[PDB]
């Protein structure tokens, strides 16, 4: 059948692109191959099925378990015992994932987006535009004037160590371990590795995280990374950076990771389960790109210009499969912008104001540039910081770890970056993204009324600190 | 000794005004009479000692107690034999109050504010400005060019029923009950009554809240008020509005509250303790306003103009003792503005962007105008809302109660109000205040990238709803 737009993929980029295009009056088809455990439709891509949603769910349940075991007596809460029912914990997450799968199907129905459960591939050009063939769980021959490629990503594998999701786990297996492992190994100390390592440590595993890169969380503000590393060590996450990993061997019983530590001493990490979190790679498997001449760069990303247009007429690409931050909200921003451009509008995507969030305890969130980056560009700046120990709400909450930091241009006072480590950082950062979108100044934050007592007041005080006039520190 | 500024009161308005005046290079004295348990200094006024700080502390601890008893099973956390050590819970709050008292003393030292622990009063006008006499815990005779009256408030009492903080409790007694009462009565269903009722209900009390006003939370958005009443009823708070309260009598460890319900039937509420939370009244006890002819209104508020100036030259008044929202951040806004005006600057205080927050579960937070106010002034608007049930972070969290609402001008799209009921609403509202301070539009909120998954996304979606184009609902 004929459509104005065919969207290949139903992850954050594709499902939103489809909905936005439908709002703009277009007949839209969205093709997605993801399957649930019983082989049925499971929209939402990586984020819903093996990504943001399930990882955030396990982080919350594991945080409650940590609270029950170590932080309730100080509140006058006495217990006779605490035990884990892992099937129920994993079960709640599975239910949330399913709710999200169903919810997206419902959204497609409401918006009259035609959903095809299967794999979509380019067949060629025809009179009506592009011929897209659907195979696998559904067979269909579609035609569309515009095609939006939103095929996403796959977990990067360590060379010679394929994932089996039983003992050698990607993000997929990490979210489905059937029993808390005695000893868990994690390769990669980036956002995903820290989150996954935190989950399982809280549930009872001894966790060791090995990172080949010498610098820990290099993209985070220096002050943030240092404080985070300190908190993670206290929590019991044995993080080792600057290591050289050898040939990993997965035997029936033990997985042995031989490595040379940072000091140059030989080591062997012996674990019951291993999670490998060393990045994401763009996915175009089965898209039949090469056949129609759709250009990919050397890393496998679909090549696009500033407006997400590929080399083929009326073929666009968004999300993890193209350049830029590999984040759900980035994919969604591009999906919306491409639908609007197809409709004849301008669209808006600005990577400079995309926020980054780590959902560990403490939470970490930032938007804009770090001090390191500003120094690298020779951009004169002033930074102000305020600790949660001095915040009334953090004190009342019983969680005073961390700080808020605002960095401004030394001459114009324009806010160039905001960095937060502490309670609810993921939510507090919204205010900073807003300020940056208006190209606001540190003094603007400092002069905006913040409700008392709230964690948000730390952002105001950090801004006051830029001008050496914090009121509560 | 001679000071440029003498501030009478060390609550949010006064301690902040004093600090700000000192930052601006003026010589400042701050006089405050509050005493801790041992009769020593205890800065921070109502908010620190018997207000915001301890109330938020008990709310969090009692919420943890509630979580342990009812919301941990679903996360796979089996906690057996949960019990309460009330003395430890109250003790944690007492330690936090002391941290805040000590913190303000340190801020005064750091900023070179001369602190006088005692009662400050006008003596008369002199050539150097105003003669201020300190008595009680300190004896001193000061001369100030400018005086800032920040004497705060006290608890409103029912005629014939004085507080004793044993059986008939104000906010003071409510934060120090020695044992969980089997049956707790609360007169007043406003912010404090709902918060205090929630604390003690979670800890084991059967709570009944009686309110004379026929409308529940009349100042809030009606949809927010309606959902709130539904949530509180479900939680076990028996809230009755439009009742006529008779003569309350306490005797033999019991308290009888005769009343006529909204349907004209006599009733009798028999409880073990009674909290009366029916408002706050301005306090100027011992200020000696008559000696200098300082004008007070018929309720006892210090009369002031739009810039917080009284009828006496160089005498200003801020916070709860003057007109406007009786809130901590409002007092701070005025203290800062007055110090800035004394220094020769313009100052800025805008009640239209002052946020209101209720720290119940769910939390309630709003800023700006409600639909009912806009209808009344005949200003055409557009409202949009989004439920947390459709938000990925709320789902992951396991708390999907409520929604976010954005109200915009129908012609200019300028945001006129934002109303939120749900998880972390107190923190999410900061984004709305910031938008209003920049005179931003609903479309601005909608275009701003919000991190996924975060509760803040609900604010973005509510803004999309204003233009009838929500994506995830
Ligand atoms: C463990 C983990 C945690 C994460 N947490 C967060 C977080 O907290 N916040 C955040 O912003 N981001 C997070 N991410 C990143 C986020 O998941 C991605 O950035 C986002 O999913 C990218 O969306 P997308 O639509 O571009 O691609 P994807 O989500 O990968 O969706 C691609 C979809 O297309 C389908 N597909 C591919 N090829 C075809 C074809 N030929 N035909 C039909 N269908 C096809 C796939 O089956 C898939 O459903 C996380 C990732 C992981 C792995
Ligand atoms: C239970 C409760 C919970 C609350 N929760 C919140 C909340 O969550 N958020 C919020 O914004 N607001 C809250 N409030 C309101 C908040 O406490 C007040 O709005 C705020 O304290 C007002 O500050 P202020 O400086 O004007 O007065 P106050 O805090 O009352 O301080 C006045 C100070 O002056 C002293 N004083 C008075 N006269 C003299 C004199 N002659 N000489 C010397 N000292 C004197 C008093 O002892 C006191 O220390 C709450 C109030 C209560 C009762
Ligand atoms: Ca109302």
- CATH code of the domain covering residue B400: 3.30.390.30
| Token reading at A415 | 């806010």
Q: Of B390, B379, B421, B394, nearest to B222 (Cα)? A: B421
Chain A residues touching residue B459 (CB < 8 angstroms): 430
The verdict on B104 and B148 lying in the same domain is yes
- Is residue B296 within 8 A of residue B302, CB to CB? The reply is yes
User: Angle A425-437/A457-466 helices, nearest 10 degrees?
Assistant: 50
The CA distance from A398 to A394, in Å, is 6
B46 Cα–ligand 2 center, Å: 3
Buried b (16+ CB within 10 A) or exposed e, B401-423: bbbbbbbbbeeebbbbbbbbbbb
| Token reading at A277 | 């979190």
| Token reading at A342 | 């197809």
Residue B49: C-alpha distances to residues B10, B114, B446 (Å) = 11, 21, 41
Before A382, cis peptide (omega within 30)? no
The CA distance from A334 to A301, in Å, is 15
The verdict on B370 and B440 lying in the same domain is yes
Q: Of A269, A216, A444, A100, nearest to B400 (Cα)? A: A100
Buried b (16+ CB within 10 A) or exposed e, B356-387: bbbbbbbbbbbbbbbbebbeeeeeebbbbbbb
The CATH number covering residue B220 comes to 3.50.50.60
Q: Of A113, A83, A85, A86, nearest to A22 (Cα)? A: A113
The CA distance from B207 to B236, in Å, is 7
Before A453, cis peptide (omega within 30)? yes
The A415-422 sheet, strands edge to edge:
A356-358, A363-368, A415-422, A403-409, A381-387
The verdict on A199 and A253 lying in the same domain is yes
The verdict on B404 and B438 lying in the same domain is yes
The CA distance from A296 to A311, in Å, is 9
Kindly provide the residue ranges of all beta strands, DSSP E only, lying in B261-393, ordered along the sequence. Answer: 266-271, 273-276, 280-282, 315-317, 356-358, 363-368, 381-387
Measured over the CA atoms of residue B99, residue B100, residue B102 and residue B103, the dihedral's sign is positive
Four-point Cα dihedral A464, A467, A472, A473, nearest 10: 130
Residues 6+ apart with CB under 8 A from B285: B151, B154
| Token reading at B119 | 């009662």
Per DSSP, the residues of B387-417 read EGGG-HHHHHHT----EEEEEEETTT-BEEE
Before B362, cis peptide (omega within 30)? yes
DSSP-assigned letter for residue B215: S
| Long-range contacts at B112-115 (CB < 8 A, ≥ 24 apart) | B112/B22, B112/B28, B113/B18, B113/B19, B113/B22, B113/B28, B113/B29, B113/B30, B114/B1, B114/B3, B114/B28, B114/B29, B114/B30, B115/B10, B115/B29, B115/B30, B115/B31, B115/B32, B115/B41, B115/B43
DSSP-assigned letter for residue B152: -
Contact criterion met (CB < 8 Å) for B430 and A435: no
- Is residue A193 within 8 A of residue A187, CB to CB? The reply is yes
Residue B80 touches chain A, beta carbons under 8 Å: yes
For residue B299, what is the enclosing H or E element? none
| Token reading at A398 | 């019983």
The verdict on B345 and B298 lying in the same domain is yes
For A33, phi then psi, to 5°, come to: -95, -10
B47 Cα–ligand 2 center, Å: 5
Contact criterion met (CB < 8 Å) for B329 and A449: yes
Residues 6+ apart with CB under 8 A from B70: none
The verdict on A287 and A146 lying in the same domain is yes
A82 burial level (CB within 10 Å; 0-12, 13-18, 19+): middle
The CA distance from A192 to B363, in Å, is 30
Given A312, A336, A352, the domain boundary residue is A352
Which residue in A333, A428, A450 is closest to B329 by CB distance? A450
Q: Closest chain B residue to A92 measured between Cα atoms?
A: B75
The verdict on A313 and A430 lying in the same domain is no
Given B290, B323, B352, the domain boundary residue is B352
Contact criterion met (CB < 8 Å) for B67 and A65: no
Buried b (16+ CB within 10 A) or exposed e, A353-374: bbbbbbbbbbbbbbbbbbbeeb
State yes or no: B197 annotated in a binding site: no
Residues 6+ apart with CB under 8 A from B115: B10, B29, B30, B31, B32, B41, B43, B105, B108
Ligand 1 near A341 CB (within 6 A): no
Helices (H), B262-348: 289-292, 328-342
Buried b (16+ CB within 10 A) or exposed e, A24-49: bebbbbbbbbbeeeeeebbbbbbbbb
Residue A333 touches chain B, beta carbons under 8 Å: yes
User: Distance (Å) from the C-alpha of residue A154 to the closest C-alpha of chain B?
Assistant: 19
Surface of A (419-438) touching B: CB under 8 A: 424, 426-431, 433-435, 437-438
Residue A329 touches chain B, beta carbons under 8 Å: yes
Residue B305: C-alpha distances to residues A239, B240, B316, B322 (Å) = 60, 39, 9, 10
The verdict on B147 and B187 lying in the same domain is no
The CA distance from B242 to B244, in Å, is 7
The CA distance from A387 to A182, in Å, is 36
Residues 6+ apart with CB under 8 A from B271: B181, B183, B184, B185, B208, B254, B255, B257
The verdict on B113 and B217 lying in the same domain is no
The verdict on B200 and B295 lying in the same domain is no
For A257, phi then psi, to 5°, come to: -110, 100
Residue B95 touches chain A, beta carbons under 8 Å: no
Q: Of B50, B39, B48, nearest to B16 (Cα)? A: B48
For residue A271, what are the β-bridge partners? A255
Q: How many domains does chain A have?
A: 3
The verdict on B128 and B237 lying in the same domain is no
Chain B residues touching residue A440 (CB < 8 angstroms): 438
A52 Cα–ligand 1 center, Å: 9
The CA distance from A228 to A210, in Å, is 16
- SS3 per residue for chain A: CEEEEEEECCCHHHHHHHHHHHHCCCCEEEEECCECCCCCECCCHHHHHHCHHHHHHHHHHHHHHHHHHHCCHHHCEECCEEEECHHHHHHHHHHHHHHHHHHHHHHHHHCCCEEEECEEEEEEEECCEEEEEEECCCCEEEEEEEEEECCCEEECCECCECCCCCCEECHHHHCCCCCCCCEEEEECCCHHHHHHHHHHHHCCCEEEEEECCCCCCCCCCHHHHHHHHHHHHHHCEEEEECCEECCCEECCCCEEEEEECCCCCEEEEEECEEEECCCEEECCCCCCHHHHCCCECCCCCECCCCCCECCCCCEEECHHHCCCCCCHHHHHHHHHHHHHHHCCCCCCCCHHHCCEEECCCCEEEEEECCHHHHHHCCCCEEEEEEEHHHCHHHHHHCCCCCEEEEEEECCCCEEEEEEEEECCHHHHHHHHHHHHHCCCEHHHHHCCCCCCCCCCHHHHHHHHHHCCCCCCC
For residue B122, what is the enclosing H or E element? strand B119-126
| Long-range contacts at B267-271 (CB < 8 A, ≥ 24 apart) | B269/B185, B269/B208, B269/B210, B270/B183, B271/B181, B271/B183, B271/B184, B271/B185, B271/B208
Residue B130: C-alpha distances to residues A12, A333, A356, B2, B32 (Å) = 66, 61, 54, 10, 18
Contact criterion met (CB < 8 Å) for B398 and A92: yes
Residues 6+ apart with CB under 8 A from B14: B7, B8, B30, B32, B45, B148, B150, B318, B319, B335
- The size of chain A, in residues, is 473
For B259, phi then psi, to 5°, come to: -155, 165
The CA distance from B117 to B31, in Å, is 6
After which residues does chain B show a gap where C to N exceeds 2.5 Å? none
**Residue B298 Ramachandran class (φ > 0 left, ψ -120 to 50 alpha, else beta):** alpha
Chain B residues touching residue A65 (CB < 8 angstroms): 75-77
The CA distance from B417 to B80, in Å, is 45
Contact criterion met (CB < 8 Å) for B88 and A74: yes
Residue B29 touches chain A, beta carbons under 8 Å: no
Buried b (16+ CB within 10 A) or exposed e, B176-204: ebeebbebbbbbbbbbbbbbbbbbbbbbb
Which ligand sits nearest to residue B93's alpha carbon? Answer: 2
Q: Rounded to the nearest 5 degrees, what angle is found at the Cα of A327, between the Cα atoms of A322 and A328?
A: 105
Ligand 1 near A356 CB (within 6 A): no
Which residue in B52, B84, B393 is closest to A56 by CB distance? B393
The verdict on A380 and A340 lying in the same domain is no
- Is residue B459 within 8 A of residue B406, CB to CB? The reply is yes
Given B352, B372, B389, the domain boundary residue is B352
Verify whether residue B452 is a known catalytic residue: yes
Q: Closest chain A residue to B86 measured between Cα atoms?
A: A76
Contact criterion met (CB < 8 Å) for A456 and B430: yes
Q: Of B472, B469, B458, nearest to B394 (Cα)? A: B458
- Is residue B417 within 8 A of residue B429, CB to CB? The reply is no
B153 Cα–ligand 2 center, Å: 6
B31 burial level (CB within 10 Å; 0-12, 13-18, 19+): buried
**Catalytic site residues of A?**
452
- The range of the structural domain enclosing residue A427 comes to 353-473
DSSP-assigned letter for residue B453: S
- Is residue A144 within 8 A of residue A269, CB to CB? The reply is no
User: Distance (Å) from the C-alpha of residue A84 to the closest C-alpha of chain B?
Assistant: 5
A261 burial level (CB within 10 Å; 0-12, 13-18, 19+): middle
């Amino acid at each position: 059948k004929q459509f104005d737009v065919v969207v290949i993929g139903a992850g954050p980029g594709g499902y939103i692109a489809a909905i936005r295009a439908a709002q703009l009056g277009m007949s839209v088809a969205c093709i997605d191959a993801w399957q649930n455990g019983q082989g049925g439709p499971a929209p939402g891509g990586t984020c819903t099925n093996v990504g943001c949603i399930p990882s955030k769910a396990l982080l919350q349940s594991s945080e409650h378990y940590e609270q029950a075991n170590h932080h309730f007596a100080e509140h006058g809460i006495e217990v006779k015992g605490v035990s884990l029912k892992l099937d129920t914990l994993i079960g709640r997450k599975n239910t949330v994932v399913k709710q999200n799968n169903d919810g997206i199907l419902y959204l497609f129905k409401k918006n009259k987006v035609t959903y095809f459960h299967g794999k979509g591939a380019f067949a060629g050009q025809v009179d009506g535009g592009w011929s897209i063939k659907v195979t696998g769980t559904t067979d269909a021959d579609l035609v569309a004037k515009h095609v939006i490629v939103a095929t996403g990503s796959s977990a990067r594998e360590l060379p010679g160590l394929p994932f089996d999701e039983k003992n050698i786990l990607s993000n997929d297996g990490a979210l489905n371990i059937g029993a808390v492992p005695k000893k868990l190994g994690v390769i990669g100390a980036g956002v995903i590795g820290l989150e996954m390592g935190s989950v399982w440590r809280r549930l009872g595993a001894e966790v060791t995280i090995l990172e080949a890169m010498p610098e820990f969380l290099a993209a985070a503000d220096q002050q943030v990374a240092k404080e985070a590393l300190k908190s993670f060590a206290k929590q019991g996450l044995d993080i080792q950076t600057g290591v050289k990993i050898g040939e990993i061997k997965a035997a029936a019983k033990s997985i042995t990771v031989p490595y040379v530590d940072a000091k140059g001493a030989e080591q062997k990490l012996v674990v019951d389960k291993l999670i490998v979190s060393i990045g994401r790679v763009p996915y175009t498997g089965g898209l039949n790109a090469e056949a129609v001449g759709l250009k990919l760069d050397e890393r496998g990303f679909v090549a696009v210009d500033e407006d997400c247009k590929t080399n083929l007429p009326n073929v666009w690409a968004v999300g993890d499969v193209v350049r830029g931050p590999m984040l759900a909200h980035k994919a969604e921003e591009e999906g919306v912008a491409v639908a609007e451009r197809i409709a004849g509008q301008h669209g808006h995507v600005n990577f400079a104001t995309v926020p980054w969030v780590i959902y560990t305890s403490p939470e970490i969130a930032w938007v804009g540039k770090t001090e390191q980056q500003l120094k690298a560009e020779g951009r004169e700046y002033k930074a102000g910081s305020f600790p949660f120990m001095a915040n009334g709400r953090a004190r009342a909450l019983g969680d005073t770890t961390g700080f808020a930091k605002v960095i401004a241009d030394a001459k114009t006072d324009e806010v160039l970056g905001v960095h937060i480590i502490g309670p609810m950082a993921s939510e507090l950062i919204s205010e900073a993204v807003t300020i940056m979108e208006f190209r606001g100044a540190a003094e603007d934050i400092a002069r905006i009324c913040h409700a008392h007592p709230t964690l948000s007041e730390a952002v105001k005080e950090a801004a006051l600190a830029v001008d050496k006039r914090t009121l509560n520190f």
